[PDB]
Design a binder for this molecule. Sequence first.
Ligand SMILES: Cc1ncc(COP(=O)(O)O)c(CNc2csc(C(=O)O)c2)c1O
Ligand SMILES: Cc1ncc(COP(=O)(O)O)c(CNc2csc(C(=O)O)c2)c1O
Ligand code: FES
Lengths: 461, 461
Amino acid sequence: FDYDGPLMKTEVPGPRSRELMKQLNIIQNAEAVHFFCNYEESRGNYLVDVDGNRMLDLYSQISSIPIGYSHPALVKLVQQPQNVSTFINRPALGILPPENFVEKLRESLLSVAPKGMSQLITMACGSCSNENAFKTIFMWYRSKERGESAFSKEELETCMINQAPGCPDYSILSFMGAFHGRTMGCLATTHSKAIHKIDIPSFDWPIAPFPRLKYPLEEFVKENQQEEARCLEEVEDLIVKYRKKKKTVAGIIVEPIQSEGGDNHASDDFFRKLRDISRKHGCAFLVDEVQTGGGSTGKFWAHEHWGLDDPADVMTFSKKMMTGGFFHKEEFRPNAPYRIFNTWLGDPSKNLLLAEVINIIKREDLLSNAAHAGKVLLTGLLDLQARYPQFISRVRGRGTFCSFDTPDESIRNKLISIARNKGVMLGGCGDKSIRFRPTLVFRDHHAHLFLNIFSDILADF
Amino acid sequence: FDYDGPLMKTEVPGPRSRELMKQLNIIQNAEAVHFFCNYEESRGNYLVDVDGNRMLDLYSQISSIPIGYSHPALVKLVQQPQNVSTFINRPALGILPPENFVEKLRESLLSVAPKGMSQLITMACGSCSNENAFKTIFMWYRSKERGESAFSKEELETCMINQAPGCPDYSILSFMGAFHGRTMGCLATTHSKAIHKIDIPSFDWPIAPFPRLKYPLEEFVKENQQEEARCLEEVEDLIVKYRKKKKTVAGIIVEPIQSEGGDNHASDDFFRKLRDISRKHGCAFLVDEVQTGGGSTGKFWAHEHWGLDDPADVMTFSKKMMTGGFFHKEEFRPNAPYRIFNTWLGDPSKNLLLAEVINIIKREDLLSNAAHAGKVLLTGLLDLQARYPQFISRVRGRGTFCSFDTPDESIRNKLISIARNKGVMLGGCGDKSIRFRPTLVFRDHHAHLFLNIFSDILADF
Ligand SMILES: Cc1ncc(COP(=O)(O)O)c(CNc2csc(C(=O)O)c2)c1O
Ligand SMILES: Cc1ncc(COP(=O)(O)O)c(CNc2csc(C(=O)O)c2)c1O
Ligand code: FES
């Protein structure tokens, strides 16, 4: 369900986008705006802008569109008279859930639960997903320390005024290069770009190095083992050190592939050993699959590649999943209500969409497709790397979750700008990487279409 | 548009709710669930549950349903073919807004901008609204201090690893009794109930007393003035104290009426003077209208009662507004992009609904209606207070934003439970208060429906 290919009329942003950008800039800083879109005319992998340009979208709204624009199955959903209520009657889900709440969850999120995690709480975005995952971990850790006993009077009084022992000085360990969100808890575990962090108060929490692999992988096996081993050791040293500082690490958060920090990969071995280190020190292992989740790596959750029956304690998600939330082990279930809570806790209308999305992913075998189409894309990227080593390096990926580096930021930006005017939307990450986040209806021939367009771009560059 | 009265079939929760609650409790702690709802049959002021009970809803999903259930105008929006894309193609608004983004904002949020605030950023909930308001304020304050100097190399370095000077030790001043959300920045400014705070790490930020008025107001004129004056003094002393601690107060956050902490009111004079204190010390004045905003006090924003051309620097909202976000003064506009940002920044489908909600609020004169229906409700509560002083005290309100105290938490809960079985849904707040948050289609006759039901309950209690 889509178009024959891209179709360009103007440079991007064109005159109509620039006019709208001017208008928007009156009421807010609109410098980040790429262009304005005609979503009504957008279909599948193709995004249409207000100047009528039709572009192959390989960025998919920062990796948040699961099965393409204007998907017919979703159109049908909105058209059904029985579904009107779900769009106009938003519940305070924590206290007054709709009749079909549990059954819709069975049809969607529960049908793709990670191994070992029977519990699920929903949230509206990745940031509150992670924030509440932190809180779940903090109260679990305190539960271990206090055992089956009541809150003390001192705890109940001091927590109201932001003081210990009611408010503990627990920490969450994160990695350099990580991105976990922008609210002030999330942000403390984020180490992506200075502009995300500067001028905002933070937490003194431990920050570990994330492995920086050397490419091609075939030539640096030993170097890369040594790099991962070094990082694992520093993780353990940090845990020990912060326990001594009386800032006990209650949890470790990591992405299976670091996105905003520059598509940084690491071996499955690294993550298995990281999981073990976490368990060994009594740390909750929190896997952030807000961006890797939803199938683009070839399996529904990227951590599935690790092949563990006990992959993690908590796993957050959002973006492609339409709603946010987190799965977790039964032992992390809050002991009392109103500790993990907010007004909306997601939105049943997003669950409605998600059930149909998961139905499409399964019926059309889109996990296999992502593996296959991703192989085609990565193969082509390796070929272009060979042919253009002065522009392309560190080609890397899993499924369609691929990326490469350019010599510098200006070349990176120029390549994105040229590709866009040629009908292909690409994302950047880090200071000089280009990344791919195609929707799940991205096929072989889209990979070939991109590769052939980019090939001629490089030839003329 | 509405039913004509409650109709009860069973106890609440009834057998079908209890069954669904048992199912949900398998996958998560479901102890907060009141009952399960049939939103398809709910209409106007009435919530229908899965056991067929029809209740007059005076709690409105924690004050978040603006013009009642299944409003025919919202029904017709979802039925329009041209609106289908808005519900199934959700954009990364910060980079790729839809063509109609600015116009739909003109039809909705911009048409009710607070005085003096030309800027608007949208967010998906109250918590990230407040979080990003804090961040806007921190960046503004730092910008004041560094003048036209650029980011120092040291700041750019240290901010990446959660260290000063890149991460300043700025504080937000908040009030005892406040509720501003659940994410870790918000939570530090929240001082509502211990169960919201316990076992979660916090910030050492200043906490001021919020005035506790004495009732009847007419008999405590001098006392209430002195109480408010005392609280103002303690605020100013805190700002000074924390400047010395090198934890400079960059902003002050306050609710025009404290909700979760027990519907605590203060005079318009108090807030005007608090605003003056904020400006005097160069603190941003942040008004949280997430719960007071959207008309139930008789004015669209509760701070409008204060009568100021310059009521605040930043004002956050959510709930009735369908979307969250914050308005702010031009001088608080972020200097660079990607500092206030996240994946979705709200949802255009909420803006679509909100434009129609605001149209209805204006055409049906619902601000004035809330002032009237609220006066009728308050008058009846005062009658019940006079007749039942063993149970009812401190009756108070503005518009339909009303409340009263009971003798203890046990009685508070019993009255709510009995009212519900008698066909009226009430909310609690604080330790022993009962509150009202009726939808904006709550009329004087609904006030009398409630009052007659509750009169009978009190006579038999
Ligand atoms: C791994 C990971 N964890 C958490 C988040 C936060 O999700 P949202 O709060 O934006 O929904 C994200 C969101 N992605 C994202 C990429 S850049 C953008 C930003 O805020 O600048 C946000 C994520 O990729
Ligand atoms: C004045 C005020 N400020 C901020 C918020 C946070 O909004 P949400 O994050 O819940 O959307 C709220 C939300 N209201 C609310 C009432 S109790 C509930 C909770 O989390 O327990 C949340 C609010 O009333
Ligand atoms: S923090 Fe997730 S929607 Fe506001």
